[PDB]
Amino acid sequence: LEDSLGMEVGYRLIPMVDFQQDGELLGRIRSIRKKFAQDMGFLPPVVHIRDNMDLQPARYRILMKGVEIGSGDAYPGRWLAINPGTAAGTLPGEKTVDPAFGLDAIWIESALKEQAQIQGFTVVEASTVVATHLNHLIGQFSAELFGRQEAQQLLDRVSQEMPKLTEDLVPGVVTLTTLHKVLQNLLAEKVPIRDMRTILETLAEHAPLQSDPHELTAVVRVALGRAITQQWFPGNEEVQVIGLDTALERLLLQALQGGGGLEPGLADRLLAQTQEALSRQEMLGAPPVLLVNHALRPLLSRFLRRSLPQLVVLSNLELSDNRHIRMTATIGG
């Protein structure tokens, strides 16, 4: 057995972690976990911190179930100057790399702080660096961190709000195993699970006749359509998405039923042009959203996100029919 979420730390990062001392990282973690619970819909597990004298004074390792998923530096008396893309010149110091987004970074002394801000850098203290890293890792592994016990804790906490919904569904109609796999499927594709009533209502309707967690994932995502549409396109602005070629769509649809399919070279064209469309979206300031026909969403999501996990494959039945959609990137032959 192992801690589902841990952090080993060298002796200079003990202060920010020690409650008796300043404990500044303690409060940043507590705020990360509560912002995460009200955004993504489940409270991430407590981070068990311990000291490891095998670690260099200023190094830390963020672990999950005993497996290292992160590591980096943090110097208590110094600051991390980050190039957000626009910064100019450089600064004396250790020229490392941002732990979360990989941006270029310099560890400057405290007296060079205003120098960095004038040169366009973003300056943060050491605890802010560890907290940013851990926050980015919790989001990336939110599905893996949502374990079976976390589903039970979520079910208990929710049974107070919707008692008729939870006892008459789990485990008589939907087992904790099936409900956990479904919620995990949503989290793996960055769909929030705040709206447990909609989720549980939906599973209550379909799970009698449909026990496969993947088929139930599709009908729950549709039920969460407004939450999905609003997360990537907040407000009333224009919905800028990747779509694929009309012919390609029908040709992809033929291959799934009778007819088809496409040459394996075109399957690799499909992958390369998705990478081209992806890079075009961030150039346009658009979101990395590929919008396809419902019968193609589960297929393209598994097929593309295997190598392009940053991609978000939404479905036409999930996108709110009241918003204006412009295809701003294509996927052809």
Q: Give residues in contact with Ca ion (CB under 5 A).
A: 319, 321
Question: Can you tell me which residue has the tokens 């939404």?
Answer: 314
| Smallest gap from residue 232 Cβ to Ca ion (A) | 14
Closest CA to 328 of 269, 292, 277: 277
| Smallest gap from residue 195 Cβ to Ca ion (A) | 8
Burial of 77 from C-beta contacts in 10 A (0-12 / 13-18 / 19+):
exposed
Neighbours of 248 (CB within 10 A): 21
| Smallest gap from residue 165 Cβ to Ca ion (A) | 13
Of 197 and 302, nearer to Ca ion (C-beta) is 197
Strands 59-64 and 6-9: antiparallel
Of 180 and 297, nearer to Ca ion (C-beta) is 297
Instruction: State how far Cα 127 lies from the chain centre.
Output: 22
The CB-nearest residue to Ca ion is: 321
| Smallest gap from residue 112 Cβ to Ca ion (A) | 53
CA gap 208, 211 in Å, rounded: 7
Of 68 and 205, nearer to Ca ion (C-beta) is 205
Of 63 and 319, nearer to Ca ion (C-beta) is 319
Of 319 and 331, nearer to Ca ion (C-beta) is 319
Which alpha helices (DSSP H) does 224-263 contain, by range? 225-232, 246-256
Strands 67-73 and 59-64: antiparallel
Of 57 and 192, nearer to Ca ion (C-beta) is 192
| Smallest gap from residue 28 Cβ to Ca ion (A) | 36
Strands in the chain per DSSP E: 6-9, 48-51, 59-64, 67-73, 79-82, 94-97, 104-108, 122-125, 239-242, 289-292, 312-315, 325-329
| Smallest gap from residue 226 Cβ to Ca ion (A) | 9
Of 69 and 325, nearer to Ca ion (C-beta) is 325
| Smallest gap from residue 241 Cβ to Ca ion (A) | 12
Residue 224 near residue 198, CB atoms below 8 Å: yes
CA gap 80, 270 in Å, rounded: 40
